[PDB]
Design an enzyme around this catalytic site. Structure first.
Site, short mmCIF file in Angstrom:
data_model
loop_
_atom_site.label_atom_id
_atom_site.label_comp_id
_atom_site.label_asym_id
_atom_site.label_seq_id
_atom_site.Cartn_x
_atom_site.Cartn_y
_atom_site.Cartn_z
N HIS A 209 52.79 35.19 60.39
CA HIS A 209 53.73 36.26 60.76
C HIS A 209 53.38 36.95 62.07
O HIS A 209 54.16 37.78 62.50
CB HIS A 209 53.95 37.28 59.63
CG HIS A 209 52.80 38.20 59.33
ND1 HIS A 209 52.48 39.27 60.16
CD2 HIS A 209 51.99 38.24 58.24
CE1 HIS A 209 51.47 39.89 59.57
NE2 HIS A 209 51.14 39.31 58.42
N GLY B 190 47.52 46.73 60.87
CA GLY B 190 46.57 46.05 61.73
C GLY B 190 45.48 45.29 60.98
O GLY B 190 44.72 44.54 61.59
N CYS C 219 45.92 42.86 58.82
CA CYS C 219 46.38 41.49 58.52
C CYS C 219 45.46 40.49 59.18
O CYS C 219 45.09 40.67 60.35
CB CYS C 219 47.82 41.28 58.96
SG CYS C 219 49.01 42.36 58.12
C1 QI4 Z 1 52.71 43.40 58.94
C2 QI4 Z 1 53.38 44.06 57.72
C3 QI4 Z 1 52.47 44.64 56.62
O1 QI4 Z 1 52.64 44.36 55.44
N1 QI4 Z 1 51.51 45.51 57.05
C4 QI4 Z 1 50.46 46.10 56.32
C5 QI4 Z 1 49.42 45.39 55.71
N2 QI4 Z 1 48.42 45.95 55.01
C6 QI4 Z 1 48.43 47.27 54.88
C7 QI4 Z 1 49.41 48.12 55.44
C8 QI4 Z 1 49.40 49.53 55.29
C9 QI4 Z 1 50.37 50.30 55.86
C10 QI4 Z 1 51.39 49.72 56.59
C11 QI4 Z 1 51.45 48.36 56.76
C12 QI4 Z 1 50.46 47.52 56.18
C13 QI4 Z 1 54.32 43.09 57.01
C14 QI4 Z 1 55.55 43.52 56.52
C15 QI4 Z 1 56.38 42.65 55.84
C16 QI4 Z 1 55.99 41.33 55.65
CL1 QI4 Z 1 57.04 40.26 54.77
C17 QI4 Z 1 54.78 40.89 56.15
CL2 QI4 Z 1 54.27 39.25 55.93
C18 QI4 Z 1 53.95 41.76 56.83
#
Ligand code: QI4
Ligand code: QI4
Ligand code: CL
Ligand code: CL
Ligand code: CL
Lengths: 301, 305
Positions: B41, B143, B145
């Site tokens: 992603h 951030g 990920c």
């Molecule tokens: C990049 C974002 C995501 O989940 N971020 C986060 C990942 N982990 C913690 C977070 C805390 C607060 C805010 C965002 C957090 C995202 C959104 C939708 C999809 Cl389908 C995918 Cl694969 C990725």
């Protein structure tokens, strides 16, 4: 989102762990530059535990009595000296993995990460707080002596603890990296007992702010309290008094969530009076006191 | 004495963390040999996430679109490919700090250490369990990920998890290092919800053994039970079924403490039907299910890495 007890990454400290052997005792040492730091009780035998004269025992030792092992390499000890309860073994090789570091002495309620080691080998990393009674509730077995407590300041390791002993209640006592014990403890087999432990009130409040940031609100109430009325109640539950310093330190969390410190204090008083009624806060059925206001801000923002 | 939630030492994994930037997205990569692994992603924008064709998005990318940074050195991307939900960036430099490693897919109930990173920099390490609903109750901000989960086997790092996203309940979802998600999740902006979670029964039993090893024994009773009767009671409290494999795995702890598994099961059964009555076990008022039997043995015996 989420709130976990999180330790600092231990890599910078793993590269410093060595094994220190003196006679029949083997424990852990911290190799920084050309010095290995370790508990001075490594020089003690069976007769020198109840009332050891460390200065006299160390004078009788030679550099060849200390066996220092870093991985599979034996380090050559070229000097030995003592600073309070820490033994300093000068070696002929400077640790190439020495990180940027500081020796810091911490106050009760402060948290740190512990890298538990055996035979100079890191086996686990966990998170601790210095209890108000100056002990730590660690997880240590025989041979863990010399394991260190630390925090990471950007890319700098602040060493704040070195494990020396387990008290009869299963709690742990140790020193800063200058060899000064935390608490009224001595490195002698004499009868020693930790004082009655209390809850770190400022940390519980910081953790209640973490829960609000994470969307937990059930424990909030419309009440506020005076600092003195709060302390009178908190003390009855073996909670540490909350000082004006603690109120000030909670200020940023108070501004971020919109809840005043004395307002959050009234929620804590209610929780102490009622319990949780089958509910949890951040997945916990007890009030957590091992997250400082600085830890909550770092982990949430 | 003492019983803590303990993670594996993270040093071997810290030497592998790099920062991966593609367009406006910056996340973490795992640099092993001459390959950087990261969530696919990273190649998405706002529109792309809603309904993404990753094969088409990746074909439009060039190696120079990926900015990989290891400490203060920029790595040169010389190739890119996709394996399920993981993106593999071939680089011109093999990571000199690459430890002995394996890619392993774990089962629910298994625990692992997470090295939470931001901008390729490790900021924290914590121990967690892969829930029976395939989520992890982690602690992650935007951030994070590309942060990885691992176990240490002697001196071999087994990478088992890579963080992909946060579900609306605040729990987390990700993949193994071959890009296959744990659970019925997808890396697309769509309505997704974790299933109702259950308690990892074998881990609660392992933790009750840890409490006995530490001297906390008020919950022990004279009774034993059948695996059949225990599982009937377990299903009612949303506890995972306990299999004969779980009973066997708890064997060494049973031998050490003198408490047969079905004897400990009768203790767990009463704890479920009656509560703790104001008492705690290892300083906890809830039954802890994020310590496996191997974790309890490793900690209560001091195995090193
Ligand atoms: C990049 C974002 C995501 O989940 N971020 C986060 C990942 N982990 C913690 C977070 C805390 C607060 C805010 C965002 C957090 C995202 C959104 C939708 C999809 Cl389908 C995918 Cl694969 C990725
Ligand atoms: C070396 C030992 C000690 O407490 N070690 C341990 C340290 N940590 C945990 C242990 C668990 C079980 C057994 C020993 C543990 C000790 C004894 C008395 C004195 Cl005064 C000193 Cl300085 C040191
Ligand atoms: Cl602060
Ligand atoms: Cl709890
Ligand atoms: Cl086992």
């Amino acid at each position: 989102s989420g709130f976990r007890k999180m330790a600092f990454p231990s890599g910078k400290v793993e590269g410093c762990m060595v094994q220190v052997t003196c006679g029949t005792t083997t424990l852990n040492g911290l190799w920084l530059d050309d010095v290995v730091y370790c508990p001075r009780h490594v020089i003690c035998t069976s007769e020198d535990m109840l009332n050891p004269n460390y200065e006299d025992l160390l004078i009788r030792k030679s550099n060849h009595n200390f066996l220092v092992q870093a991985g599979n390499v034996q380090l050559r000890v070229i000097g030995h000296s003592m600073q309070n309860c820490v033994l300093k073994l000068k070696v002929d090789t400077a640790n190439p993995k020495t990180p940027k570091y500081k020796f810091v002495r911490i106050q009760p309620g402060q948290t740190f990460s512990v890298l538990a080691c055996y035979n100079g080998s890191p086996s686990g990393v966990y998170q601790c707080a210095m209890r108000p009674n100056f002990t730590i509730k660690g997880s240590f077995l025989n041979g863990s002596c010399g394991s260190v407590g630390f925090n990471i300041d950007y890319d700098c390791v602040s060493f704040c603890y070195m494990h020396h002993m387990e008290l009869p209640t299963g709690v742990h006592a140790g020193t800063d990296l200058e060899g000064n014990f935390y608490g009224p403890f001595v490195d002698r087999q004499t009868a020693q007992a930790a004082g009655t432990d209390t809850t770190i009130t400022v940390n519980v409040l910081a953790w209640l702010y973490a829960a609000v940031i994470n969307g937990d609100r059930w424990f909030l109430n419309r009440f506020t309290t005076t600092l003195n009325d709060f302390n009178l109640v908190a003390m009855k539950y073996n909670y540490e008094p909350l000082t004006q310093d603690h109120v000030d330190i909670l200020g940023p969390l108070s501004a971020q969530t919109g809840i005043a410190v004395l307002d959050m204090c009234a929620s804590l008083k209610e929780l102490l009076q009622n319990g949780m009624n089958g509910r949890t806060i951040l997945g916990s059925a007890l009030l957590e006191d091992e997250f400082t206001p600085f830890d909550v801000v770092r982990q949430c923002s």
